[PDB]
Amino acid sequence: MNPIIYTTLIMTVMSGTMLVMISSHWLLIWIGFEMNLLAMIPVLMKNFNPRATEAATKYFLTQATASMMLMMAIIINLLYSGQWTITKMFNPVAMTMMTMALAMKLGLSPFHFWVPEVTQGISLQAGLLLLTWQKLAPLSVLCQISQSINPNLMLTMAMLSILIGGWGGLNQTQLRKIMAYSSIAHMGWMTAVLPYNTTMTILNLLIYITMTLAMFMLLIHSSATTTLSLSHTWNKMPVITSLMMVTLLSMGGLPPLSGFMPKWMIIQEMTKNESIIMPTLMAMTALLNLYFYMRLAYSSSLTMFPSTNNMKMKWQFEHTKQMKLLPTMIVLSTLVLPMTPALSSLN
Amino acid sequence: KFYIREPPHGSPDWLKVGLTLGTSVFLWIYLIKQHKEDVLEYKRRNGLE
Amino acid sequence: MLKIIIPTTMLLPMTWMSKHNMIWINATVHSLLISLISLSLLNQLGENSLNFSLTFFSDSLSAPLLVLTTWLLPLMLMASQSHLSKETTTRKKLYITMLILLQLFLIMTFTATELILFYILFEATLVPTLIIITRWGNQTERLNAGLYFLFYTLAGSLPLLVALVYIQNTTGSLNFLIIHYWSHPLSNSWSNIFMWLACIMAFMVKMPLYGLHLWLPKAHVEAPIAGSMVLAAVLLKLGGYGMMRITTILNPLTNYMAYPFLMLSMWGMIMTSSICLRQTDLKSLIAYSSVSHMALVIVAIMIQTPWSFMGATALMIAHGLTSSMLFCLANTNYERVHSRTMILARGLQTLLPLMATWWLVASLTNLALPPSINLIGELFIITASFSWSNITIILMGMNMMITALYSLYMLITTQRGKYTHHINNIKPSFTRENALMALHILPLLLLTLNPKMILGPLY
Amino acid sequence: SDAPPLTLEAIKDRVLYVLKLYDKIDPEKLSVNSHFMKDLGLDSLDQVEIIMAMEDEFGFEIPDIDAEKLMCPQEIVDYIADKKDVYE
Amino acid sequence: PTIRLQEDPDPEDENLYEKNPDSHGYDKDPIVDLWNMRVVFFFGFSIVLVLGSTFVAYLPDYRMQEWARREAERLVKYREANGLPLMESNCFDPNKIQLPEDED
Amino acid sequence: LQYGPLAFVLGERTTRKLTETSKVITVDGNICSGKGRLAREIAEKLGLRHFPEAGIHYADSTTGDGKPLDVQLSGNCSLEKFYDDPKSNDGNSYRLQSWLYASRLLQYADALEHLLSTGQGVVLERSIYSDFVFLEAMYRQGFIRKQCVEHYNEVKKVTACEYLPPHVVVYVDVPVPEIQSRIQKKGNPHEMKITAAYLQDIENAYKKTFLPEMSEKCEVLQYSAREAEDAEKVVEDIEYLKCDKGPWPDQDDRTFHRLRMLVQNKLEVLNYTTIPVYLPEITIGAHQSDRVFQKFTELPGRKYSPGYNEDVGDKWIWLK
Amino acid sequence: MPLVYMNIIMAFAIALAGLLMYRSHLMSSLLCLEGMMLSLFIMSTLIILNTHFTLANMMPIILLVFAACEAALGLSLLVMVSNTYGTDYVQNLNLLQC
Amino acid sequence: ARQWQPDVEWAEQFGGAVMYPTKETAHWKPPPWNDVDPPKDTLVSNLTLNFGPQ
Numbered sequence A: 001m002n003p004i005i006y007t008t009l010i011m012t013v014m015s016g017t018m019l020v021m022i023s024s025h026w027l028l029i030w031i032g033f034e035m036n037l038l039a040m041i042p043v044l045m046k047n048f049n050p051r052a053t054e055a056a057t058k059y060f061l062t063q064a065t066a067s068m069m070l071m072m073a074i075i076i077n078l079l080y081s082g083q084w085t086i087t088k089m090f091n092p093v094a095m096t097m098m099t100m101a102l103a104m105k106l107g108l109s110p111f112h113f114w115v116p117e118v119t120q121g122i123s124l125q126a127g128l129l130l131l132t133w134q135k136l137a138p139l140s141v142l143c144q145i146s147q148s149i150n151p152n153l154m155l156t157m158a159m160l161s162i163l164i165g166g167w168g169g170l171n172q173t174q175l176r177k178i179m180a181y182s183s184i185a186h187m188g189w190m191t192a193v194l195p196y197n198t199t200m201t202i203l204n205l206l207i208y209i210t211m212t213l214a215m216f217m218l219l220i221h222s223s224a225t226t227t228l229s230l231s232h233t234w235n236k237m238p239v240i241t242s243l244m245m246v247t248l249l250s251m252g253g254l255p256p257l258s259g260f261m262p263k264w265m266i267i268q269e270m271t272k273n274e275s276i277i278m279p280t281l282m283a284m285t286a287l288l289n290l291y292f293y294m295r296l297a298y299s300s301s302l303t304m305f306p307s308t309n310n311m312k313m314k315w316q317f318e319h320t321k322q323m324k325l326l327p328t329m330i331v332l333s334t335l336v337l338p339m340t341p342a343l344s345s346l347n
Numbered sequence B: 001k002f003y004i005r006e007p008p009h010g011s012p013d014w015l016k017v018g019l020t021l022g023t024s025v026f027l028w029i030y031l032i033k034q035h036k037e038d039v040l041e042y043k044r045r046n047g048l049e
Numbered sequence C: 001m002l003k004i005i006i007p008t009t010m011l012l013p014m015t016w017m018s019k020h021n022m023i024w025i026n027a028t029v030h031s032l033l034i035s036l037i038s039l040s041l042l043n044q045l046g047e048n049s050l051n052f053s054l055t056f057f058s059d060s061l062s063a064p065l066l067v068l069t070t071w072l073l074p075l076m077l078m079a080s081q082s083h084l085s086k087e088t089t090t091r092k093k094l095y096i097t098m099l100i101l102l103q104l105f106l107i108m109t110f111t112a113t114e115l116i117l118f119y120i121l122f123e124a125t126l127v128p129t130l131i132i133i134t135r136w137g138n139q140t141e142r143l144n145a146g147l148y149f150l151f152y153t154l155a156g157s158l159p160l161l162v163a164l165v166y167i168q169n170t171t172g173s174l175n176f177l178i179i180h181y182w183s184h185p186l187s188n189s190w191s192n193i194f195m196w197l198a199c200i201m202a203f204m205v206k207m208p209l210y211g212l213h214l215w216l217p218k219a220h221v222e223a224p225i226a227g228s229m230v231l232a233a234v235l236l237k238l239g240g241y242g243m244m245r246i247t248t249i250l251n252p253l254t255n256y257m258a259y260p261f262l263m264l265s266m267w268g269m270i271m272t273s274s275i276c277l278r279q280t281d282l283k284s285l286i287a288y289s290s291v292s293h294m295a296l297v298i299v300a301i302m303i304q305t306p307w308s309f310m311g312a313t314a315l316m317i318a319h320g321l322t323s324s325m326l327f328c329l330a331n332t333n334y335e336r337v338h339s340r341t342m343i344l345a346r347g348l349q350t351l352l353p354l355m356a357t358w359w360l361v362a363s364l365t366n367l368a369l370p371p372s373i374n375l376i377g378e379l380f381i382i383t384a385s386f387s388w389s390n391i392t393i394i395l396m397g398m399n400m401m402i403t404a405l406y407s408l409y410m411l412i413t414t415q416r417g418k419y420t421h422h423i424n425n426i427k428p429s430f431t432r433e434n435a436l437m438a439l440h441i442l443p444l445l446l447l448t449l450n451p452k453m454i455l456g457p458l459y
Numbered sequence D: 001s002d003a004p005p006l007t008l009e010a011i012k013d014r015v016l017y018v019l020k021l022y023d024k025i026d027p028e029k030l031s032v033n034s035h036f037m038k039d040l041g042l043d044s045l046d047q048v049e050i051i052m053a054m055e056d057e058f059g060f061e062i063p064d065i066d067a068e069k070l071m072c073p074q075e076i077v078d079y080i081a082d083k084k085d086v087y088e
Numbered sequence E: 001p002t003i004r005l006q007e008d009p010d011p012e013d014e015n016l017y018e019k020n021p022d023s024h025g026y027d028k029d030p031i032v033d034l035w036n037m038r039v040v041f042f043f044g045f046s047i048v049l050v051l052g053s054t055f056v057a058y059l060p061d062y063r064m065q066e067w068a069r070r071e072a073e074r075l076v077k078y079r080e081a082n083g084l085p086l087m088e089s090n091c092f093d094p095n096k097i098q099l100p101e102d103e104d
Numbered sequence F: 001l002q003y004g005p006l007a008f009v010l011g012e013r014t015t016r017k018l019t020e021t022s023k024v025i026t027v028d029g030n031i032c033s034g035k036g037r038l039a040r041e042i043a044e045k046l047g048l049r050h051f052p053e054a055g056i057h058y059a060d061s062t063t064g065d066g067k068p069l070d071v072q073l074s075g076n077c078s079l080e081k082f083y084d085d086p087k088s089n090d091g092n093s094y095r096l097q098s099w100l101y102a103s104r105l106l107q108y109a110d111a112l113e114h115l116l117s118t119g120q121g122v123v124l125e126r127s128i129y130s131d132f133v134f135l136e137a138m139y140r141q142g143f144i145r146k147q148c149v150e151h152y153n154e155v156k157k158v159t160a161c162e163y164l165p166p167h168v169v170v171y172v173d174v175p176v177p178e179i180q181s182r183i184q185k186k187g188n189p190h191e192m193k194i195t196a197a198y199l200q201d202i203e204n205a206y207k208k209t210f211l212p213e214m215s216e217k218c219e220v221l222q223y224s225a226r227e228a229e230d231a232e233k234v235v236e237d238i239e240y241l242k243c244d245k246g247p248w249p250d251q252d253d254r255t256f257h258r259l260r261m262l263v264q265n266k267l268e269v270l271n272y273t274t275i276p277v278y279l280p281e282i283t284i285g286a287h288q289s290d291r292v293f294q295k296f297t298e299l300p301g302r303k304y305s306p307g308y309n310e311d312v313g314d315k316w317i318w319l320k
Numbered sequence G: 001m002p003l004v005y006m007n008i009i010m011a012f013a014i015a016l017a018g019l020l021m022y023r024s025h026l027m028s029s030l031l032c033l034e035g036m037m038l039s040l041f042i043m044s045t046l047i048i049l050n051t052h053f054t055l056a057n058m059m060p061i062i063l064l065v066f067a068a069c070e071a072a073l074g075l076s077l078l079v080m081v082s083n084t085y086g087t088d089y090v091q092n093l094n095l096l097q098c
Numbered sequence H: 001a002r003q004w005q006p007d008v009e010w011a012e013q014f015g016g017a018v019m020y021p022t023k024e025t026a027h028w029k030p031p032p033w034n035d036v037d038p039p040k041d042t043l044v045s046n047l048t049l050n051f052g053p054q
């Protein structure tokens, strides 16, 4: 693909997301989703390799179905009130349809099946974009209509996403499927606190985005998409594996790392609303994510796996293209807990 | 020495170094001036001085 | 209190800017000086604590713990520099960084005024410990051990967090002074029962309490020497300190919720003490003696009397010193014969006469020979337990009898009898090892002359 | 899961079923060691049809060579065991 | 090759006494090892162990034990001369206590 | 400005650099033939950059200083000991073959980068496309196992598919007895232990497989020993070729941009040479890996990036 | 709500159901996507005409436009899949698992 | 006298398609080293037509 065409497709994806983010009319939000998907499909197929075609087809079918249910919910809401403004969604059937459409777009359980397949079928740069930028528009819509959201349905899907992401990650040797299941669990954490406090949802999204960017850039730096391929990196660039281990520990949510701040901030919020069982189950379930992060850390950094002879040749060459925002992303994803009160700047 | 002459070497890229240092000092000067203005405005509004 | 924290933080850049052959010297000297500075916290009041600032305070319970924590770092550095000889420079500095970070976290943990900050530091102590165990342990089991260490602790402490932010939402604060002054009774309800369990089980797993003590014989055995030293001497006492701190909010609910834990402790004392009698691994025997000793601290904290609290403080300090010394003594033999089997190397008193004297003194303090502070703490707890119920003397008495049996057995197997014929690489003791033993044992004996310094806030 | 661990007994049962399914062979007369040409009076063309029936039965191509020697059922069993790597 | 990889043989441990018969067991370099020994001994046994123990022994009585003994002596003397009870059953005065209305 | 998407957006294309003289030419042939002198003379006549055959220490010459490194830190294989003991149980044979294929891949990437950045043609001795003739001869003589051949084919499948094969394939055909006599005359004591069956297998691989599928994408110029010395005839024979059979005329500026982005960044070129397939001949244990890597880092110009080594005369480091 | 509105909503539900329950051909599912778009167009046009919202009269046309972009997208993908397998069966899209 | 580090038999546990192999899942295979599957050379038939005689 031509670099100018790639640039304009990326700008169209971002423009669709921003159109969703600045619109007050439901039709413009729908148009933003459509425009985002239209430019998103060719980015997933940048390298042809039929697995990418499969991932693009699955993604298109899922997102088109979600768009249709979203439009139907918009029309039902209009029928029961001649309103186009995005507000508290005067009709409850329309609200259920809208919540299901947005849950399909985000990949919350049980609409979660597509995320591991599409992520495994695309490249690491496409996976980075899919797991970071694509969540902004649906979550920005959910923040706006959160007051009319039914807690029982949203929280059921949140608990299901946390459980399913934790269970699915345990069985994975491929790094992109591990990232997908981690994404499902973090989406569940984001949407569990949404009916209570949207500032906590935004804070969790930002911390998850910086952690995911750091992890994906570290996986791009060491061109590894499998556990065994990543296990060779200690013998070529030890610093990369050390930073990967610290980022994995942070993603696990262990204090005093940055990953801990969102969970700590969500549990507290849920306790102010007399929700005790829900945060306890969520916190205990996140230990599955921690386990399959610790297993990767064992494979890549805390022990040394056997290497190959040709690796010697790689000792003579340097990483040519540098990612300028990787150091900032690593520091932001690890050493940011002491500045937790700054979250008040998000409301 | 080296086989390929390794173009970025003992004479550093002085334009980039100058731009980096200029940006740092410009940011610092702006920040000190901003803090002085903030203190003066805060004292003016609160009837302190 | 920053006059201790900041010098500890300066140990990191000092270690990273040192010469390749000077890291051990610099780290040892400056950690010893930090211990010297830490000795000033022993000047405690009789009525309230030393409230340095809104964030940090020191009490008669946390001051001896702080002194032991700072004193342990030089001993760990001395014990580590032998088996890390062939290591690269940067990995040596990383190991020393792990130890310094652990000390920093522990120092802040013991002095935090607010329970959430205490929780955050008490959980942060996990990362350096796990890295130490799973990166510098010697065998393949060290990975599994790490997992056992990680998930036993967290599964206990995740409810605790949920309890703590719950409490602040109803009482308004988690500051310990406010918590103590504005204390209110706990009603007898299912919600209060589960809040009691959430506030207690996290600390119970750290002790550990018999039944959830499985992680310990793995983690202590597979860890490197400094890892096991810090795990036994300080990390086990985090549970005791936290339980002592959090018990104020618990009353009067503790009177009936303590029964299952008292039964588990008073029976698991016998169970683990008897397990020590049939243990083919010497380091595993030393590890199990720790569970047997901490059961007594659990009993003392649960029965909630001034004599029991004094005894628990004294026993925690004495056990820290004695268990660290025993782990070092076993490591001296391991670095010779490269096996932890107790019957592999015998008759060592013939070949290593002064290390045999060290072994004898460590075994004597382990079985609480009077007037050692091991005995002081044990006897105070036994007297308080007798007040709680006379029948306890039977269980307590039995434990004492068993403890002496596996201690001297450990002494007779490794030091007496005849040396195995095939082994011929048993070199004379180094000055480093002898000094490491002396710096363990001399403070222990010196604490006998001033026991009020280790008897806690109830003295 | 994929196909079960086929054994020699299964091969023999299938081969004998195929042979007893052939019109030009009376069923109870044929044995495992009966030579096709001598015992059953079968011509060269008949053998070709039987081998093709084996290829349909077991789903693998038996060349013209290595089929000129499978002259009794037992040799067919041995050939299929060799090709599929079955020993017990 | 019936080996699964190319690997170094496991090396045998080094005896520090072979090259430094008075080795102290701190380091391979004799000078660095000797200074490690001297610095550990001086800063552990001479500074922290002796001076720290002396400092702790002579700590001032901030626990107020002698003060409490003096106050107790004063009150015992005062009460005995007076003929008042040596110790009082109630720490807090009854006059300042407002019990609930009635016993039923 | 290093070449990249931004430089492609603003102007620069590679189709404008091609001047009908690009002509990636490889000059193959068996051992101890005259292909080296023929290649140098062809590069001299046509004004093309010549590439001497990539050996064990080829990668050393393109990085740091061109001085070869120790065999322990580079290669970890010996051609001399392959001749001494072809069936050694320490895996030297396939380790040598796999390292040599990696070196040939790096050389092909360097040659392609030079051509695509300057427009000047390149002459190579062998390439990744003819490397396998040495592998087959190794396998037919029983020097390597079948697993080694499968691993070689796996590495070749994911690497050789990313490049354009050469325009001109020159083959120098010299019979086995003549190269045998040349070997006996050269004087190298290790090289005389090459059996006739080994050279016959190399020729069989060259003629049965390599040339037939090389000749279906571009014309192949075969020559004998005596007419190979006549370089001007070969050069003018190359001058009158009708290159209409390969994918080279089927290349656009975007495909050339992708190829050029690949041929720089040698780490991406060598990506799949170290795939986690654990064969004993090439797998190195963790302890040896750690020791040898630490030994490599202690080399005078290897601890840091090229411009940041104070101990090889770098200066103004604190301002870079 | 009159019977016509429920008939349009039932048409949308039948199409959504048709989309969800896959048979073999990919094109059969693209047709159900088109049907869902048609049902939405009719529903919104009926609501807009009934309430006499004049400005909203342009939104179904817009709704039609992005219907084509979604169809043209889908057909494009259907080409590539077919070019890989010589068949548009959804059974072939099983290279990636969960 | 040497710290234990993983060997090939240890490393091969993570080389599978899934961490826990299952009777059904043991027949899953790992993806190719590049994400490129072998080209499915599907026989797209050419239509055959009779042009003439009539």
Ligand SMILES: CCCCCCCCCCCCCCCCCC(=O)OC[C@H](COP(=O)([O-])OCC(O)COP(=O)([O-])OC[C@@H](COC(=O)CCCCCCCCCCCCCCCCC)OC(=O)CCCCCCCCCCCCCCCCC)OC(=O)CCCCCCCCCCCCCCCCC
Pocket (backbone or CB within 6 Å): A001, A002, A003, A004, A006, A007, A008, A010, A011, A012, A014, A015, A016, A018, A019, A125, A128, A129, A132, A133, A202, A209, A213, A217, A321, A323, A325, F005, F006, F009
């Ligand atoms: C609550 C407050 C906080 C809010 C937080 C908000 C969210 C935070 C971030 C969320 C997550 C972000 C994730 C980003 C993923 C991006 C994916 C990606 O690029 O790949 C990774 C990429 C991989 O690189 P690689 O694989 O090594 O490179 C190989 C190439 O890909 C090989 O490819 P090639 O060879 O083709 O190379 C081409 C290359 C080289 O580039 C070129 O050559 C340039 C050529 C120029 C061509 C010009 C064409 C112009 C014609 C097109 C016009 C289109 C119009 C569209 C609009 C239509 C409107 C109707 O171009 C690129 O690589 C990508 C170009 C990117 C273009 C960006 C376009 C921006 C559009 C903005 C839309 C919004 C507009 C307003 C809309 C209003 C509503 C309507 O590396 C990274 O990006 C690392 C991560 C970077 C993330 C940045 C960190 C976050 C942001 C930090 C800065 C501050 C942010 C906050 C700002 C606050 C406001 C001021």
Ligand SMILES: CCCCCCCCCCCCCCCCC[C@@H](O)O[C@H](CO[C@H](O)CCCCCCCCCCCCCCC)COP(=O)(O)OCC[N+](C)(C)C
Pocket (backbone or CB within 6 Å): C188, C189, C190, C193, C210, C211, C212, C257, C260, C261
């Ligand atoms: C191996 C190491 C594990 C750690 C050990 C932890 C031990 C936890 C045990 C908790 C101590 C007590 C819990 C609750 C107190 C009483 C429980 C019950 O048995 O007593 C009766 C409770 O009544 C009934 O029995 C209800 C309980 C029956 C259902 C619970 C099942 C318990 C079975 C044991 C499960 C094993 C525990 C550990 C799980 C891993 C009391 O009679 P009642 O007057 O009516 O209730 C008064 C309580 N009020 C005031 C709150 C109302």
Ligand SMILES: CCCCCCCCCCCCCCCCC[C@@H](O)O[C@H](CO[C@H](O)CCCCCCCCCCCCCCC)COP(=O)(O)OCC[N+](C)(C)C
Pocket (backbone or CB within 6 Å): C035, C039, C064, C065, C067, C068, C071, C317, C443, C446, C447, C449, C450, C454, E048, E049, E052, E053, E054, E056, E057, E058
């Ligand atoms: C090798 C040969 C061995 C035998 C030969 C040796 C010769 C004999 C030497 C041994 C002396 C025997 C001891 C006899 C007792 C006399 C000492 C006693 O008088 O001192 C005590 C004083 O001891 C100190 O109080 C205890 C020292 C504290 C120990 C701290 C260790 C240093 C820090 C190291 C870190 C370890 C971590 C610890 C964690 C808490 C008395 O306390 P106190 O009743 O008041 O004093 C009254 C007068 N004052 C108050 C005015 C001072």
Ligand SMILES: CCCCCCCC/C=C\CCCCCCCC(=O)O[C@H](COC(=O)CCCCCCC/C=C/CCCCCCCC)COP(=O)(O)OCCN
Pocket (backbone or CB within 6 Å): A274, A276, A277, A280, C152, C153, C155, C156, C159, C162, C163, C166, C191, C192, C194, C195, C197, C198, C201, C202, C205, C212
């Ligand atoms: C290494 C293993 C250690 C295991 C430790 C796990 C046990 C921890 C104890 C329970 C944890 C959850 C307790 C929740 C925190 C308490 C806060 C609280 O007070 O909330 C209660 C609510 O309490 C609960 O909901 C807790 C119910 C249990 C939910 C999760 C079940 C966990 C399993 C229970 C049994 C296991 C506990 C003992 C096991 C010991 C370890 C083996 C009342 O609040 P309100 O709703 O506002 O009521 C007043 C106004 N209506």
Ligand SMILES: CCCCCCCCCCCC(=O)SCCNC(=O)CCNC(=O)[C@H](O)C(C)(C)COP(=O)(O)O
Pocket (backbone or CB within 6 Å): D043, D044, D045, D046
């Ligand atoms: C749909 C129906 C339409 C029909 C299609 C028309 C088919 C026409 C095909 C004509 C081709 C021939 O004749 S091909 C020529 C065949 N003739 C020979 O081979 C001569 C020697 N004879 C023999 O070998 C044996 O008699 C023999 C019986 C062959 C078996 O041999 P075995 O000893 O090894 O069993």
Ligand SMILES: Nc1ncnc2c1ncn2[C@@H]1O[C@H](COP(=O)(O)OP(=O)(O)O)[C@@H](O)[C@H]1O
Pocket (backbone or CB within 6 Å): F030, F031, F032, F033, F034, F035, F036, F053, F079, F097, F100, F131, F134, F191
């Ligand atoms: N790909 C290879 N595999 C194994 N051995 C090779 C390979 N390439 C070159 N050699 C060996 O390197 C030596 C020189 O190669 P050769 O082309 O035969 O002679 P020269 O290039 O010096 O004219 C020979 O001993 C040859 O066998």
